[model samples]
Target chain A: SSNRMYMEKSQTELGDLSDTLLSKVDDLQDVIEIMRKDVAERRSQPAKKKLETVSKDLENAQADVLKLQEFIDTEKPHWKKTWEAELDKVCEEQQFLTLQEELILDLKEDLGKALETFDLIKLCC
Target chain B: SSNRMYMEKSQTELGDLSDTLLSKVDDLQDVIEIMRKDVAERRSQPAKKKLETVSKDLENAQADVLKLQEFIDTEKPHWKKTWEAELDKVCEEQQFLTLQEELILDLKEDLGKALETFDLIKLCC
Candidate 1:
């Protein structure tokens, strides 16, 4: 079970994602009038994604976690194994969460700056 | 009266922003060992910022919102102006929020994918 874990992400995370989107779509309408070309916040170049670096580390962590998980699932309860297994899993999972949160926030901050004035413009007639 | 509106943004928004970031920094640790290059998730080219376009639009929006805001703040109660003022302001604010939300979600989704494996991996020993 090398990387079967990718399948487990909860849909709720995705759900909140779409729910919050309505506000953006609503705001986009005003931009039609508020902005002429509409690139005020758009990247001049479509930001090239960061696929290889963290993606690779993500894989390695996953592999380790899977091994740990397997050891837990298959191994009889050994105090040493549980401690070791849980510790590694906890560390790796937190790291991923932390990194993921950072990535989202960076974009969020920039997005805020981009929309700073746009929001006000749209509000006017 | 131009765009004094920019000053009105609440600090709470920024507050939540920093609060959640704690998670990503947490995950970045293992990547020290989990990753060697660190550019796996980084863009090969440092993304050239999207200045000018949206930034300009933001300026335009801010100007419009300010005029409308001033109208509301100082205008002797006139039904026509108030109606127009509120309508424009509402529309612009919502658009900004919606666009802002969309921007956040896009990065959020991709970040989620990048960490898909990392999260699970860290969970194990």
Candidate 2:
């Protein structure tokens, strides 16, 4: 549960970062579109260069987002499996009620966060 | 091996980000401690007001860190499970070797980064 809680917090942070990045991408897209129109309509050399730069930046940002998502997909399982196994072991050993309860809550929190982030990604990405 | 490799790279990036945030936190802590000392001996009203602001900023930063951790704990598992299930299903269907290899590699990279980031957070936070 503790782990789950932490994961949720991490996802929230990641989601926030993604939103910020997405906003930047939107800004870049707008800039590029304007520049493209300016170049086509007015034959502006400066607009051409600026448009190219913005395009490149947009591509880079997209790549970064993809990589970040890929990372989340891969490592999450190992952490979850490990946590569950450890929890079972602890339970079998008959740990103190207070500690057990705390641990369980912590695990649940982590799982909840993970699930929440997954939903956010599925919807947003 | 791919998972491990990906985890390592993820760790590297997380480590870099962690360094940046940690430095910020350190600066805040330093400012707060200095303000504490200033309040102890300095009778200057202006200094006292400035110190109070800095102290509040430092406390806010620390709280942000704790909350961030809580979020991370909550959201990482469901995504992992879903990915694993998807991969297993595709693999069982005997998907194209090249495509399968590519997906596997991608998955490994994601896992690697996740593991890496976990390590980074563990050490720095």
Candidate 3:
């Protein structure tokens, strides 16, 4: 019964976490869009190259988080009765989430720096 | 003359950024130590494995930040006069800093999840 209670709590928490991850992906995509716009406007080679790299990384991270969402929605419910058996899977899922979070954060920071570089170049030119 | 002024400002800003990077590395190391202690105390297999992975990642990131610090201290000064020549290098440096920052953040998140899982297992046991 305690395990069942914990499993229900975990399911609720995981659903909330999945929602947060979804929003984070949206925020990352928004930042990437802004970076793309800046690159197009400035046509700065360095910024363009950085944006391209970050865009690719973000695409991969987006796919990863979507898979996590699928796991939470479909596979998670079946594991409720055998929660211990699924501990490794849950740990792996958390690892994936952390990885995606880092990927998005890295892209966001790079985009900021690229924009700053573009602005500085504009000032000098 | 305007370029000289910008170079002076950039140098000052970069010094500040380097200091921030150093502190972030310190914070990351502190987190890694805490994770290490947690794993030792709990001896949870999942937590121990996760900590090992995060510890390795944090070590690599710490080395990276230190290298960036060295670059800031030594090579950056000579570039003061030839700021344009060093633009590519500065961009690369920014990329590395972003990478280390992401690495630390990912480790922190993973450690948090590992601890949570450990606690849950304790409750069940």
Candidate whose lDDT is highest = 3
Which sections of candidate 1 miss by over 4 Å? A1-125, B1-78, B116-125
TM-score: model 3 vs. ground truth: 0.25
Per-prediction interface RMSD?
Answer: 35.8, 33.6, 34.7
- The TM-score between candidate 2 and the true structure equals 0.29
Ranking by DockQ: 1, 3, 2
**lDDT (tens digit, per residue) of candidate 1 on B1-125:** 22213212212333343444433333322322222222234413211242334345445544544443343334223323433454454455345445544654564454444364334333321
Candidate 1 lDDT over residue span A28-102, tens digit each: 333222222222344122112322433454455445434433433343233234335534543453454455345
Tens digits of lDDT, candidate 2, A1-125: 66545544545554565556556555654654555455557755343455456546655665766765665566456545645654453343233323433544553454444334333333332
Give candidate 2's error at residue B68 in angstroms.
Answer: 44
lDDT of each: 0.37, 0.47, 0.48
Off by over 4 Å in 3: A1-3, A39-49, A73-125, B1-125
> Model 3 lDDT vs. the true structure?
0.48
Cα deviation of A12 in candidate 3 (Å)? 3.8
The alpha-carbon deviation from the true structure for residue B15 of candidate 1, after best TM-score superposition, in angstroms, is 46
Grade the docking of candidate 1.
incorrect
Better of 2 and 3 by DockQ: 3
Tell me each candidate's RMSD, in Å, in order. 35.6, 31.1, 34.1
Question: TM-score of chain B only, all predictions?
Answer: 0.28, 0.40, 0.37
Report the C-alpha lDDT of model 3 over B1-125, residue by residue, as the tens digit.
65445545645555555556545555554554554444457642334464456445555555555555554556444543454443443344345435533543453454344334333333332
Best by TM-score: 2
